[PDB]
Design a protein around this nucleic acid. Structure first.
Ligand code: MG
Ligand code: MG
Ligand code: MG
Ligand code: MG
Ligand code: MG
Ligand code: MG
Ligand code: MG
Ligand code: MG
Ligand code: MG
Ligand code: MG
Ligand code: MG
Ligand code: MG
Ligand code: MG
Ligand code: MG
Ligand code: MG
Ligand code: MG
Ligand code: MG
Ligand code: MG
Ligand code: MG
Ligand code: MG
Ligand code: MG
Ligand code: MG
Ligand code: MG
Ligand code: MG
Ligand code: MG
Ligand code: MG
Ligand code: ZN
Lengths: 50, 155, 60, 207
RNA sequence: GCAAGGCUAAAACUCAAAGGAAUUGACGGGGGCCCGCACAAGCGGCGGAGCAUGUGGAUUAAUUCGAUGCAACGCGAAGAACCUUACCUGGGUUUGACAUGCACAGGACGCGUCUAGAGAUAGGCGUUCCCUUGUGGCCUGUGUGCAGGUGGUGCAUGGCUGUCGUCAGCUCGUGUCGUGAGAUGUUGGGUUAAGUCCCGCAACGAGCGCAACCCUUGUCUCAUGUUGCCAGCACGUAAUGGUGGGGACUCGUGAGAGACUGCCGGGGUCAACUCGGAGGAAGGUGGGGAUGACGUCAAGUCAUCAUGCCCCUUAUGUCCAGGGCUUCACACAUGCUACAAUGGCCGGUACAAAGGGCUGCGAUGCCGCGAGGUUAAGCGAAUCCUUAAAAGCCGGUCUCAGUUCGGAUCGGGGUCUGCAACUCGACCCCGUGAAGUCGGAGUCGCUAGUAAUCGCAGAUCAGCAACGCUGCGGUGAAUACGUUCC
């Protein structure tokens, strides 16, 4: 509801998107797996290594 | 509307009976979006129409509509401190509409059990000039032919 | 709300069903979302301000 | 009232978010200390004129970019208030904090610095029409400014009945999505209550 | 003067005005033109019944406060058994549940027991880290300022919001005209959804609005291949794309192409623009959203927060247990389920979309008529669960009855959540089977994937009074002569 009191019929719509990508299945070479995690990703990017 | 006339919608030919008059009847019977239900009523009543005559049913249907199409309607108009009815000429595709509404309407309050035998008996009684749908035809005509004195104010 | 009731809802109550939520900015007992911890009012200024990431106005 | 916030309407198109993190489970955790950092900074550093506060957090490492018109004041005598509030910013969150008090290039083409400067003058018994024309004429002297609106509303000089007045120069197209419209709100602490100062600055379309 | 009455003509007293012309607006049962589900033309309702929910009044110890023509009334409340809670009765407390500053005195705290409805009070115990070695932290004591107040004023206010109205308007700079308020520009001719644009003119410009920029849906191209897809290979067991694998098709989502009166014909000052084509997924704003100019209503909110005054401080602060906010001669309002055969019931079978999931989603198995219980796989998820969509289709039966319609109310028996289901939760089983047979004067919504009807999901949330609200897809109409009237 927009108003702080008694105006039910006036409303907002907020969303929250979340993007997913890069399901890459690279070779676990022990030379690479060091350099996979050396780079600083930005603050607004999450990463899992599963 | 203020901005002139609106385009009207084309009706596709009916597959069982190759006529657009049948598919214009199923849209009058249609309630609550039950169109496959509305077509079983119209197809079922037309099959019962040939079971009591032997004749093709849409020929019986067009004879039934020609006995209930009005030619003069009786639209109302106020002039001063009094009102009256002006007899005006029904354009033809309104008379198709206004007669299909009377067949569906007067057979929903008819004395049978199911809608198939209610609708079929009203079609057969209108193609002989007997039903209540035929009775509103001459009631519309006798009302409009009792007011020829007011046919000079036709907008 | 009243400042005693904001501290009471923060602590650990007797009979753990007796707990509830308040807005983390103004301490409002109603219309508090669980994803944010905020009421309907404090969600609306903070989303316009760009102060909580990922949230903006939707049109479709 | 009737007009939307100019920052949220252009969020994700023209302007940009202030908090830069991600939280799949620890979201209300992060918001509850987000609204505690911003209380501590806004109440205690108001002489410096905070433009805004950016908080980006990367896995138990929160970095606070706080902008001001006057970078030398909050540091003081080689960190007597800078690392002081940084100490109270670690007693707050329980985490090691990078702090950066940067700059403002022109603190006259910057709403929330223009709006704070007018309300500081409104809390000095200055005539309100005099304070509103200084902020406008100092802003149109800036190069990349094509328009400014300043609105003050409240009791406006100790009058009994509240009213609202606004001036404008240039063009402020609020209905334009491609426009770069800055926006500020600050609240004068006068002796007759509160006066809200609103500033809209138009700085070209899009880069 | 026959009369009606004419002529001459005061004052007491009372008021601070009474007037004249012009100006801007508002209004008219004035005029011209124009629009809008405004009417008409249609389709389905509401007002009658029963229940749900809010409100008026009444009641009560209290039924906390706010909202009150449109623009209050399934509104604040996106969840009142305790909590929430602001109210009532009663029991406690009083630098206090919370913050700091100053003055004298040294562990806070924790677990466990007893008392009490609880709050708290006590028997106990574990105990001073820090150099309470001076100096730190902390503690209550003891005060002091103070803290605290959902106490008042929305007619002192900020903020935020409704609203006229998503109506097409509202103004300014310079010039000119008028003693002046003011006028002109913004009028006139067309045209537009539009102060949209063109042509004229003592006006020339400019700004805020309109349009555009953004999101969503409608077609295509390129990139892309898992957890998604399966054309052609191989396995297909169990037919569970299950497997090797494929980049074809969809789809997912990045980047782009596309619609502009661009092209043709007629009309128009050759102009704006309009009527009709061609090509295209789409044609003149393609559909819908986001977006509320200057202001109006002393509109709403001091109970989101903030705040100026004002009041309370052994209480109008604050803790707790029970009760209330759910009462009930009535009245209104918004909905739901109905009054059946275009239907009910039973059996069989088909086709979605958008969402949720770790204090979780519970597949499978097993027990129960059933709500459920139990066991436990897989899954922070295009992977697993939610998840069987319901209408629909086909078959059978009922046979127009207050009924095999309706499912209120009441009797009995249960399950689950929770410390706790009496006041006052939902769901399940068996029994019971009320009013209601289409609704008076009146009144509402809707112009197309709309109305009508059918399910599914989310938020708040332990559970829920969810028939609400915000969304999602399924099936899918009837009409519009027209502008006289409201
Ligand atoms: Mg609760
Ligand atoms: Mg006059
Ligand atoms: Mg008029
Ligand atoms: Mg319309
Ligand atoms: Mg009508
Ligand atoms: Mg009723
Ligand atoms: Mg009340
Ligand atoms: Mg409503
Ligand atoms: Mg209670
Ligand atoms: Mg007000
Ligand atoms: Mg005008
Ligand atoms: Mg004028
Ligand atoms: Mg314009
Ligand atoms: Mg627009
Ligand atoms: Mg008022
Ligand atoms: Mg009021
Ligand atoms: Mg107060
Ligand atoms: Mg209580
Ligand atoms: Mg209530
Ligand atoms: Mg039944
Ligand atoms: Mg079935
Ligand atoms: Mg079983
Ligand atoms: Mg059947
Ligand atoms: Mg009866
Ligand atoms: Mg009957
Ligand atoms: Mg729930
Ligand atoms: Zn809040």
């Amino acid at each position: 509801i927009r108003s702080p009191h008694k105006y039910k019929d006036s409303r907002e719509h907020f969303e929250m998107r979340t993007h997913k990508r890069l399901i890459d299945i690279i070779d676990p070479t022990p030379k690479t797996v060091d350099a996979l995690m050396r780079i600083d990703l930005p603050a607004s990017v999450d990463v899992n290594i599963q | 509307p203020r901005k002139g006339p609106a385009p009207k919608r084309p009706l596709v030919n009916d597959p069982v009976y190759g006529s657009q008059l049948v598919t214009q009847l199923v849209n009058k019977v249609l309630l609550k979006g039950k169109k496959s239900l509305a077509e079983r009523i119209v197809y079922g009543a037309l099959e019962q129409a040939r079971d009591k005559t032997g004749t093709d049913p849409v020929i019986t249907l067009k004879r039934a509509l020609d006995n209930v199409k009005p030619a003069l309607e009786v639209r109302s108009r106020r002039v001063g401190g009094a009102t009256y009815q002006v007899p005006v000429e029904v354009r033809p595709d309104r008379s198709t509409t206004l007669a299909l509404r009377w067949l569906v309407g007067y057979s929903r309050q008819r004395r049978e059990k199911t809608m198939i035998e209610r609708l079929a008996n009203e079609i057969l009684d209108a193609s002989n000039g007997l039903g209540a749908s035929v009775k509103r035809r001459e009631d519309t005509h006798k009302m409009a032919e009792a007011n020829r004195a007011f046919a000079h104010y036709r907008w | 709300a009243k400042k005693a009731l904001v501290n009471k809802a923060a602590g650990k109550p007797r009979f753990a069903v007796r707990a509830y939520t308040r807005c983390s900015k103004c301490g409002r007992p109603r219309a508090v979302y669980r994803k944010f911890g905020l009421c309907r009012i404090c969600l609306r200024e903070m989303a316009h301000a760009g102060e909580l990431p990922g949230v903006q106005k939707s049109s479709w | 009232g009737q007009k939307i916030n100019p920052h949220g309407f252009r969020l994700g198109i023209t302007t940009d978010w202030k908090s830069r993190w991600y939280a799949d489970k620890q979201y209300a955790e992060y918001v509850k200390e987000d609204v505690a950092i911003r209380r501590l900074l806004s109440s205690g550093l108001e002489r410096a004129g905070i433009a805004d506060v950016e908080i980006e957090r990367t896995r138990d490492r929160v970095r606070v970019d706080i902008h001001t018109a006057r970078p030398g004041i909050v540091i003081g005598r080689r960190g007597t208030e800078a690392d002081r509030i940084r100490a109270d910013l670690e007693k707050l969150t329980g985490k090691q904090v990078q702090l950066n008090i940067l700059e403002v290039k022109n603190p006259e083409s910057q709403a929330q610095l223009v709006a704070q400067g007018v309300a500081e003058q409104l809390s000095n018994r200055v005539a309100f029409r005099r304070a509103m024309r200084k902020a406008i004429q100092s802003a149109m002297r800036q190069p990349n400014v094509k328009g400014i609106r300043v609105q003050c509303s409240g009791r406006l000089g100790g009058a009994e009945m509240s009213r609202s007045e606004f001036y404008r120069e240039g063009r402020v197209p609020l209905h334009t999505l491609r426009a770069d419209i800055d926006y500020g709100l600050y609240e004068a602490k006068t002796t007759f209550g509160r006066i809200g100062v609103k500033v809209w600055i138009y700085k070209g379309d899009i880069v």
